[PDB]
Design a protein around this ligand. Structure first.
Ligand code: JHZ
Ligand code: SAH
Ligand code: ZN
Length: 405
């Protein structure tokens, strides 16, 4: 039985994805085939409605010098964060001498615009190789985890932050209480803590179970974020839905009664209550659809092999680990996975051990099918891969349902 990371309440499981490897550990073909596994399963707190995993992977197993994800590899995301940065420069960072702190700045995808504006800033990025890529752009970065203590250090030496921002980062952090204590110590009395992460509403609507893997500890909703804020002295004052990463919410927290919540907060809370998003029965129905997609996807891939049709994957996403290991998909069904990330090329995917090859290798003669694990990047990827589809190759998607197009 598992205690809620936010409130200490009881977490009831509704989905068990089985033994999983680390999502971003790509081994060389010669490397011995052991690896760390953990049980991936998800539950909902009874008190605060926080959806969360029931086993944590230690932070240092996930975030360290070989973290292979470099945010700046997507043009869509580069544009997304530039705009977010400009939006902040125009609103929250108009002070004299404003200060913005980003938790999980990675290769500096967001902070580059802040630095280029001459605004004082600090990235926390415990993963030293991406941290280094950010410093190369001139960005000020601390190779440390953000938590209560390092936030106190930063308050002490740099004074309060007008904005603390985290993208695709807070949901990676089981110790959200120490984070929030750090925000409390660091943030200006009139500041904002803004974070954006994959949205439970979108996961449930699209049955995108591949959004569940080791680094996604929390699947936030407005209902559970409002509860978490309230419980720590903050308040949810705005929400914005975002289409990136398969569907996200950007949550804006201010200290309690410092600002008036936008109409958008009540409206989303009401949609979720109306749709019974976080009712155990809804989440269990989602889990039932998860199994259906597994069963349909494997039936398709085995049918393809029996009809002599070649299948590869496209995008060696962290997400794809959950798919290949839960579904039992390896090299006998999907021969290679094509990917743009140098640190993942000439390696095997975790658990399933499918060879990863450079995307530049996905070329004539094309395979018959490409299983699109990077389905959140469909438009960006398919625009670069017109020749494949023109030649008659087809994509296999499993979100929101198994289908070919
Ligand atoms: C755009 C594009 C990507 N690709 C390849 C590159 C990447 O390996 C992967 C895409 O991964 P993408 O869906 O962005 O992140 P992943 O699920 O891994 O998830 C990661 C892990 C992390 C930090 N924990 C997180 O939360 C999100 C933000 O990112 O796909 C191409 O080959 N061609 C392309 O044109
Ligand atoms: N406690 C913590 N403080 C700051 N960053 C952290 C952290 N725990 C993990 N991270 C970093 O959080 C990042 C999650 S990946 C998301 C990166 C980027 N913000 C983007 O949206 O694409 C990784 O670079 C990881 O090393
Ligand atoms: Zn709780």
């Amino acid at each position: 039985p598992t205690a809620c990371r936010v409130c200490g309440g009881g977490v009831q499981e509704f989905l068990d994805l089985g033994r999983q490897p680390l999502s971003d550990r790509f081994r060389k073909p010669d490397e011995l085939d052991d690896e760390f596994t953990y049980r991936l399963a998800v539950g909902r707190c009874d008190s605060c409605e926080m959806v969360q995993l029931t086993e944590e992977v230690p932070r240092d197993l996930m975030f360290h010098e070989v973290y292979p994800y470099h945010s700046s590899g997507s043009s869509v995301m580069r544009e997304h964060f530039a705009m977010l940065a400009r939006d902040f420069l125009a609103t929250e960072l108009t002070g004299p001498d404003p200060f913005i702190v980003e938790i999980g700045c990675n290769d500096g995808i967001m902070l580059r615009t802040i630095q280029e504006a001459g605004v004082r800033h600090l990235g926390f990025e415990p993963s030293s190789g991406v941290a280094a890529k950010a410093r190369e752009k001139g960005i000020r970065v601390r190779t440390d985890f953000f938590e209560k203590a390092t936030a106190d250090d930063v308050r002490r030496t740099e004074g309060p932050a007008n904005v603390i921002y985290a993208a695709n980062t807070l949901c990676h952090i089981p110790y959200v209480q120490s984070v929030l204590e750090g925000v409390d110590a660091l943030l200006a009395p009139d500041g904002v803590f803004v974070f954006e992460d994959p949205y439970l509403g979108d996961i449930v609507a699209k049955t995108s179970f591949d959004q569940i893997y080791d680094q996604h500890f929390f699947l936030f909703s407005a209902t559970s974020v409002q509860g978490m804020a309230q419980r720590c002295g903050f308040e949810l004052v705005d929400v914005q839905r975002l289409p990136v990463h398969g569907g996200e919410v950007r949550y804006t927290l201010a200290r309690q009664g410092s600002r008036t919540p936008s109409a958008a907060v009540a409206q989303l809370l009401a949609a979720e209550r109306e749709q019974e998003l976080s009712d155990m029965a809804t989440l269990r129905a989602f889990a039932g659809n998860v199994v259906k997609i597994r069963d349909e996807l494997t039936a398709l891939l085995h049918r393809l092999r029996a009809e002599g049709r070649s299948v590869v994957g496209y995008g060696a996403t962290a997400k794809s680990a959950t798919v290949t290991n839960f579904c039992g998909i390896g090299p006998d069904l999907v021969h290679s996975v094509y990917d743009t990330t140098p640190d993942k090329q000439n390696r095997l995917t975790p658990g399933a051990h499918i060879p990863v090859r450079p995307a530049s290798a996905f070329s004539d003669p094309y395979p018959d099918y490409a299983l699109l694990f990077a389905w959140n990047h469909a438009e960006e990827i398919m625009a670069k891969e017109q020749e494949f589809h023109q030649a008659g190759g087809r994509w296999i998607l499993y979100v929101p349902e198994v289908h070919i197009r």
